[PDB]
Amino acid sequence: STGSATTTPIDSLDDAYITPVQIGTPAQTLNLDFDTGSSDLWVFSSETTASEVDGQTIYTPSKSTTAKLLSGATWSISYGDGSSSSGDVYTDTVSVGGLTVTGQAVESAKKVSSSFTEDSTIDGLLGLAFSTLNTVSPTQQKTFFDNAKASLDSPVFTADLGYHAPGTYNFGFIDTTAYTGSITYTAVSTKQGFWEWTSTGYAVGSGTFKSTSIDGIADTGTTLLYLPATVVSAYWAQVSGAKSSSSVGGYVFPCSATLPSFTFGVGSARIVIPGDYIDFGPISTGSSSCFGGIQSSAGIGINIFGDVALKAAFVVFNGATTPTLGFASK
């Protein structure tokens, strides 16, 4: 089997991407944030505290003939940005782009933090990291991908995120029309539960490539590119007037700037992030200070190849017995 679903930016900055997902019988379609940095599929629901719901579409398990309470199971998750959610668990039929999993754990939110409430466009998350990170207790649950894997034509999924445009998540096949040149594959460590890999270095604009190992995660659920302070300083030093602002929470730059590109290495291959991808616009409405899309990972504890980086590539998440990651230009 295979699946193919379009993923769409939630706003004009590509702050996140939403993908329609069918849950239950008859189908209830919710727009979920596919997150290769976490491993819980959770939804706004009929159980979510009413004051914490503001415009989201909810899953109502009582209206699904295939929903079953997973008795005694609870979940609770905290994300890198400080947001969180928690609740109880149902199993139900879940379909993505024509690919169906029966018995998928659907984690129903009883509580969500303010950032989730405030984002009316995101109805929940669909985790695509390794199932060892799943938070369901006392019986840990599998991700949608882990459940689907044995049925897939090939044990892979691909992320093809757009810059200010829709893109695609495919399950079970590699669309050879969706990228240019060849795919370069690189080793993955699953030790921390992430799609963790080592970039071979970077360049700023038309500058020389610096060969240096950068361990990080491929994370579709993180907006920006978070890299070591040395790398990030080298980048922003090439932008007149750019500075790190503790009051704003990272690097800002004059909105009048033309940003240089940023290149990262994948083995001997190179992925180029155009300068425009690194512009996250005014820090507040009408400001002439703009927020940068490359930020320091210092104090996160891990480097994160988030959407800024991934959307410059066609990315293969290879879930074979020895997992790997592939990157191609597009």
H runs (alpha helix) in the chain: 114-118, 144-148, 229-236, 307-310
Closest CA to 280 of 298, 306, 300, 303: 306
Closest CA to 126 of 147, 111, 110: 147
- Check 14, 33, 35, 88 and give the catalytic one: 35
DSSP state of 137: B
Please report, as a single letter, which amino acid is at residue 318: N
SS3 state at 313: coil
Closest CA to 194 of 325, 37, 327, 6: 37
Burial 209-227 (b: 16+ CB within 10 A, else e): ebeeebebbbbbbbbbbbb
**213 is a catalytic site residue:** no
DSSP state of 209: P
Closest CA to 220 of 84, 37, 41: 37
Architecture of the domain spanning 5-174: Beta Barrel (2.40)
Resolution of the PDB structure in angstroms: 1.2
C-alpha to C-alpha distance for 144 and 104, rounded to whole angstroms: 7
C-alpha to C-alpha distance for 292 and 226, rounded to whole angstroms: 11
Determination method here?
X-ray
C-alpha to C-alpha distance for 149 and 165, rounded to whole angstroms: 28
Q: Which two tokens stand for residue 169?
A: 């998540």
C-alpha to C-alpha distance for 324 and 326, rounded to whole angstroms: 7
Phi, psi of 52 (to 5 degrees): -100, 5
- Check 45, 64, 108, 199 and give the catalytic one: 199
Burial 155-177 (b: 16+ CB within 10 A, else e): bbbbbbbbeeeebbbbbbbbeee
Asked whether the beta carbons of 109 and 87 are under 8 A apart, the reply is: yes
Measured between its terminal Cα atoms, the distance across the chain in Å is 25
Asked whether the beta carbons of 19 and 31 are under 8 A apart, the reply is: yes
Residues of CATH 2.40.70.10 domain(s) within the chain?
A: 5-174, 175-330
Architecture of the domain spanning 175-330: Beta Barrel (2.40)
